Every structure is written in structure tokens, then in C-alpha cells.
């Protein structure tokens, strides 16, 4: 029974590969030569946020596009007024091994998580005036790797226990477990409509999940190593992933197959963070070579080098209005480029 | 030209920076040890005795020097980012049950994986051959030859077995131009493990200073 079970498993594998290939008449590479190239894009350090004592691992831009939250090994969450490089809050984390940080779309909450396997929600707007812990969501048997807010009450967390989950902050209990990945989940990127989310989980695979139901609609193959970063296209039906094989790859949900490969022979180090531009023409990506490379999402050519970091660019985010890009690295500094 | 409220916000940021600078001295002076051990390595007893005088943390003071021993026994992962959280760790305290001869090979494999991870290149390894009296009473009875044919001395002499174990552990270390590897044949009731750990951490900091001095 198990032999024939794997038999139709492989049969469905060939069926889906054949469907994708038959739907693949031409590549985005061939259809893009006609349109004007992005040219040369040059960015400079507008502001250099300093004050962190250790390596940054995650940064998230607020919806107002002026406040950003940063996490580092000193166990401190620092919120920056990027316009005036002023620290707003300094939240002393319970666990110093923080590996992800989030900003609520409303702006009233920030969530941090790490090796403690707990995603902790921090309330920023309280009568006492000091940021307090609102909820310690527990239930994951793996290290927290990425957490993103949907509303002020629902948050999706991905961990190393091969299972992403949607929580309920008011109850504090898990609601739906997005199981199906066979490896440690590394990153998540909620869709702009907040009804779907993708995640790469070290199996070179990214699964698109339906938040309302809880089943992964479609699994994306490709890649050769652990997908360390995943971002969602602004339009809502495409996503780009970064891995440890130094290749950024763009998938589409409707075509459920690879579209382009943003790989260059010069770089050999993996990608730690990926985020698109406001219209998605640019595919900014932070690598371990101590700098970020800007890619044209339609032609896959190096549009520019976002150099200026003394260590590996661990995190990289783009504002909602797209008027700035924030890169965090292991040199305990954040630089905002424009 | 800044407004009154913008000036006050800058003042609040200055106070936050002052607090961060106050914590900076402790952060930079603190040494962290990642304690990696097996289930039978007697990690729990050594940990309990050392403090007296998810993942866990044990902060303690040795010779007015900040210390933090990180135990990841419950949650251990082979992924790159999980190991990358401990690249800034000063030294790795590896605990091995020498007395448990039958389990030496798996401990050797784990030691090889830890020391050849390429994320622990800049950290030192403080090996701790623990259960030394158990080791001696087993050595006077049983021979390391049955489980390890490469041993060359008399399997009933303690020094021969200890040297063979140290040699076999050191051979697993692929690169010898990196941070030093330290070995100690101390039991859990030595009550001097803090002194040895401090000595080896000071030696590692000495090595870092020598690297910074362009003396090589």
C-alpha cells in the first residue's frame, strides 16, 4: 500500500510538473527586452541610526513610514523616528536571542521572537507610558523566525518546527496550524490583502497558505538551499525568495512556477533579506558580502550596489510609501537610504 | 530651530542613549560560553554546582568579570541561522562523558560537527572530559582497545587513556590556525571548574589581543 502510495505521489508530481511546463510558453526574461531598462540607480545613506550594542537581526517599517523597530542580541527593541534619528522607545527584551521583529499595521504593537520559541507582543500606547508586554504567545516547539501582524489581534508566526501558525492575541492560543513544510521555516511575507501568506522553510520550497482555511494552496519548487527570505510583490500575486545559494528567485501564484532568477556569478554568498520596491520594479536584497544588491525585478540585472555596511546586511525593509529603504547589519548600525 | 516638542523628543532620545551607553560597558565586558553536552555528559550536575559557587541562561560572576553560560540542550538545530546566533560567543564548553566508552564515538562526531561548523571559527573550544573517577575505575577494568583500535599504550594506565582521548578529540578539529582548543580532565565535583573556565577565557582573550597586535 505504501509503495503504490508513493507511486501516485510521484504521479501527481509529474502531473503538476507537466501542467506547469505546458503552461510555460515563454519566460519573463524573453518578454522584457522590449521595455526600457531601469538604468543606474544610486542610493546614499540619508540617516545612520546608531545606538544598538550588538548585531541587528530584524527590522520592520511602520505603516506611517517614519517609525521602524529593530532587534539585536543586546535584548533591546529600539523604535526610531527615522526622520529625526530619534529613539522613541527602548524595550528590554526578556530573551536576548531575538531573531524577528514586527510592527503592527495600526502602530500600537510590536512583536519580537527568537530562540525562546515565544512571540511576545509589546504594547506601545499605554497609560503608564512605558512599553509593557501584552501577550506571550507560546505553543511552538521551534525557534521563532518571522512574525507578521494581520490586525491588532491576529498575528502569523513561522518557526523552526516546520509549522507556521495564525494566533489570536486576545485569547493567547493558537488558532490554525499551517503544517506541511518539511523543514525549519525561515521567513514569511503577508499578502497586501492579508488573506494569504508565503513562507520558505529550508527545503528550497515556498508554500502559499490560505489564512482563512489553513491549507497550503500550492507549493513552489526550485532553489538549491535554505530559503532565508521571502517577500511579496506589491500587486499581490507574486513573491520573490532569497536562499543560501546566492540566487533570488521570483515566483507567481497564478502561474505557480518560476518566473526569473536573479543570480550573478560575482556574488557567492546567500541572501538574508529581500523586499520589493513600492511598484515592485526593484528587488532589493541583502547578502552576506556586507552589502545589498538592487535588482531589476523584470530583467534581472544589477541595478545598483547598496554598499556602506561594515558587516553582513541581516535585515532589509522598504517603507509603505516606498520613499526610503532601511538596511540593518551586524555592525550594530541601521542606515536609511534614498 | 527645532520646536519645543522636537527638542524634548531629542532629549528623551539622549536619555535613552545614555542608558544604552551605561549598558554598553557590561555588554562589551561580558563573555558568553555556549555549553554543548550530551545527555549522559553530566551537564546538569556541573551546571547546578557551578551556579552555587526553551534555551537556558546562567549569569554568574568570576573574578569581577561578567559571564553567561548558554545551555541549548533542549533545543538544538543544525541550521545555519541557529548556529549563527552564537558566532559572537567567546568560547564553547563541550562536555563529554569519558567514562562511557561505548558512547565516545558519537560524542566525537558531535564535537567534529561543532568545531568544523565554520560559524565557530572565531570561538574557542573548552573541552571538558567529565566523570574522570568513573573513567579511572573503568580504565582499571575495561580496555579502550575494544572500542578504539588506534590506541597504542597500555589500556590499564590512566595517563595513556587520557592522552589518547585528548588526541582523538583534537584530531577531529580540522583547522589549527583558529582559536585554541582547551582540554580539562575534571569531574563534576572538582569545585574548581570556575577557575579553569576563567583561565581559558582569559587565554582566549589573550589570543584575540595577539591577533589585534599584528604580532604574527
Amino acid at each position, epitope marked *: 500500500e505504501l509503495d503504490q502510495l508513493r507511486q501516485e505521489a510521484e504521479q501527481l508530481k509529474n502531473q503538476i510538473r507537466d501542467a506547469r511546463k505546458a503552461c510555460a510558453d515563454a519566460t519573463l526574461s524573453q518578454i522584457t527586452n522590449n521595455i526600457d531598462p531601469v538604468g543606474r540607480i544610486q542610493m546614499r545613506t540619508r540617516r545612520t541610526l546608531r545606538g544598538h550594542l550588538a548585531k541587528i537581526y530584524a527590522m520592520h517599517w511602520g505603516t506611517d513610514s517614519r517609525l521602524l523597530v529593530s532587534a539585536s542580541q543586546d535584548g533591546k527593541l529600539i523604535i526610531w523616528d527615522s526622520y529625526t534619528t530619534n529613539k522613541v522607545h527602548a524595550i528590554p527584551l526578556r530573551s536576548s536571542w531575538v531573531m524577528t521583529c514586527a510592527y503592527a499595521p495600526s502602530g500600537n504593537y510590536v512583536a519580537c521572537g527568537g530562540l525562546d520559541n515565544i512571540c511576545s507582543i509589546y504594547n506601545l500606547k499605554t497609560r*503608564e507610558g512605558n512599553v509593557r508586554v501584552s501577550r506571550e504567545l507560546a505553543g511552538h516547539t521551534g525557534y521563532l523566525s518571522c512574525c507578521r501582524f494581520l490586525d491588532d489581534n491576529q498575528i502569523v508566526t513561522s518557526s523552526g518546527d516546520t509549522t507556521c501558525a495564525l494566533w489570536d492575541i486576545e485569547t493567547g492560543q493558537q488558532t490554525t496550524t499551517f503544517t506541511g513544510h518539511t523543514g525549519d521555516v525561515m521567513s514569511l511575507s503577508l499578502a497586501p490583502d492579508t488573506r494569504l501568506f508565503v513562507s520558505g522553510a529550508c527545503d528550497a520550497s515556498a508554500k502559499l497558505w490560505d489564512v482563512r482555511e489553513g491549507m497550503c494552496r500550492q507549493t513552489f519548487t526550485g532553489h538549491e538551499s535554505d530559503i532565508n527570505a521571502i517577500c511579496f510583490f506589491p500587486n499581490g500575486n507574486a513573491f520573490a525568495t532569497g536562499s543560501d545559494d546566492a540566487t533570488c528567485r521570483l515566483f507567481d501564484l497564478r502561474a505557480d512556477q518560476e518566473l526569473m532568477t536573479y543570480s550573478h556569478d560575482n556574488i557567492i554568498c546567500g541572501i538574508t533579506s529581500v523586499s520589493f520596491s513600492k511598484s515592485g520594479r526593484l528587488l532589493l536584497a541583502g547578502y552576506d558580502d556586507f552589502n545589498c544588491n538592487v535588482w531589476d525585478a523584470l530583467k534581472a540585472d544589477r541595478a545598483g550596489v547598496l554598499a556602506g555596511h561594515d558587516n553582513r546586511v541581516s535585515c532589509l525593509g522598504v517603507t509603505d510609501d516606498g520613499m526610503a529603504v532601511a538596511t540593518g547589519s551586524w555592525d550594530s548600525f541601521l542606515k536609511i537610504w534614498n | 530651530t527645532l*520646536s519645543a*516638542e522636537d527638542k524634548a523628543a531629542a532629549e528623551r532620545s539622549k536619555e535613552i542613549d545614555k542608558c544604552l551607553s551605561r549598558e554598553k560597558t557590561y555588554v562589551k565586558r561580558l563573555v558568553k560560553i555556549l555549553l554543548l553536552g550530551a545527555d549522559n555528559s553530566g551537564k546538569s550536575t556541573f551546571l547546578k554546582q557551578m551556579r552555587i559557587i526553551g534555551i537556558h541562561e546562567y549569569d554568574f560572576e568570576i573574578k569581577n568579570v561578567p559571564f553567561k553560560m548558554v545551555d541549548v540542550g533542549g533545543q538544538r538545530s543544525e541550521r545555519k541561522r541557529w548556529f549563527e546566533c552564537f558566532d559572537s560567543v567567546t568560547s564553547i564548553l563541550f562536555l563529554v562523558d569519558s567514562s562511557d566508552f561505548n558512547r565516545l564515538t558519537e560524542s566525537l562526531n558531535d564535537f567534529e560537527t561543532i568545531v568544523n561548523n565554520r560559524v565557530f571559527s572565531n570561538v574557542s573550544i573548552i573541552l571538558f572530559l567529565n566523570k574522570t573517577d568513573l573513567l579511572e575505575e573503568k580504565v582499571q577494568i575495561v580496555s579502550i582497545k575494544d572500542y578504539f583500535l588506534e590506541f597504542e599504550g597500555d589500556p590499564h594506565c590512566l595517563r595513556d587513556v587520557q592522552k589518547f582521548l585528548v588526541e582523538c578529540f583534537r584530531n577531529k578539529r580540522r583547522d589549527q590556525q583558529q582559536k585554541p582548543l582547551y582540554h580539562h580532565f575534571t569531574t563534576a565535583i572538582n569545585t574548581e571548574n570556575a577557575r579553569l573556565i576563567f583561565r581559558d577565557v582569559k587565554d582566549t582573550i589573550l589570543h584575540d589581543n595577539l591577533k589585534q597586535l599584528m604580532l604574527q
Partner: single-chain antibody
Amino acid sequence: DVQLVESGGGLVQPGGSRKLSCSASGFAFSSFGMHWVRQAPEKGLEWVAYISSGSGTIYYADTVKGRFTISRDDPKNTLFLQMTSLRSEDTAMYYCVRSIYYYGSSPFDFWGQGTTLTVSSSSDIVMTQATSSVPVTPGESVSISCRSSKSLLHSNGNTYLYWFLQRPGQSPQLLIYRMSNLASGVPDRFSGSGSGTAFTLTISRLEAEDVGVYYCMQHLEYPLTFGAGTKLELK
């Protein structure tokens, strides 16, 4: 909850000295800056002093510069005001005001019920409102207006105008901060807008908690001059 209780009230003779102590309980006193606003027996609010978080910057009003000293004790969670050589112009009830300052904060958030001190016997931004005892029916829509001598719109893009509600016999509470933002806990019926100088506050509905005296504060200049009293009254 958040409480701000002060102490010290007596009929001191002119030229004497006294100390106003304000005790804080229920919030991080160190992070919050503290002000001191006083009101003559029947007059409007007037700013006196200010101490920042950590006792960094200490400002004073020109009428009380030198005579008055404000010191805060963070571990004691207490705010102190050393006043000497009081005149008859100091006959007032002194309000303690907390104000935390960061991006998006709500300065002048909570006020404390003051203690009355009854003394025996320019560059300041002039904010004036030309209203007094507006006849108002319950449920109607009204628009309280305030004016500023110098425009309060800074290059940062936010006007530093504040609206305060002082209910009869009750300490003032913050309604609008920065001309537009609703304060926490206040109904959406309150709404405010304005321009570089012209300011206005409109209230959609008129229930029992709205009858009182309204105030407008400038926060561009540290003298922190107030306006007159509108004195909303039921028709």
C-alpha cells in the same frame, strides 16, 4: 489608574515661601516630563514651570523666573515646586501636568487636582479666543474658535495647538493635541482643525460632560501661553 495628587495649601503672607509637592502613582514618573499650570480664583490657565525627564532642561515663566524653583525626585515619584517671595498675583490653584515627548505622543495628557494657595494681602505667543458664555442647546453642533498671534505651524508639518476641557469643579483634561489628533478616551464627537493661525474646534453632540470652559495652548514657544475662557453653557 494614573493619579497625580499634590499637597500644600495655606494663607501665606506676601514675601514668604512655600513648597508644592506633587506625588505620582500609577505610571512611570521618570519618563514623563512635568509642568505646573496655575489658575487665579476666576481666570484662565497660565504656565509656570517645567522640568524634563531626568531633570535635564528647566524652564520658567517670566513672571516667576528666579523666585520659583522646580525639582523632581524620580525614586520618590514626587514633583516639587519651591516658591519664595509670593505676591498677590500668585493666589491660584496649581495644576500638575504630565507630558511625555516623542513622535506621536500625547503631551499634557493627565492633569491633577490642584491645591489652592491663597496669598494674603513680548516674545510670548499671545493666544486669544473671542468667545464667552456661548448659548448652546443640548445636542446641537457648535464650533469653538481660538486665535494665535504667531503661526503655530512649524516646518515639521504639525501645529502645536492643544484643546483642554475643564469641567465645572473638575481638573482640566486633554481633548485635542496638535489641532487634529483625538486624545485617548475622549469621544469622537470632539473634532478640531485649523490653519497657520486660524484655529477652530467643533463638537458634534452636546451631552452632560461637555458643559465647561475650553482652552487653547500653544506649544511652539516654551512660555506656553494659554487663551481665555470660552465657558460653554447650556441654553
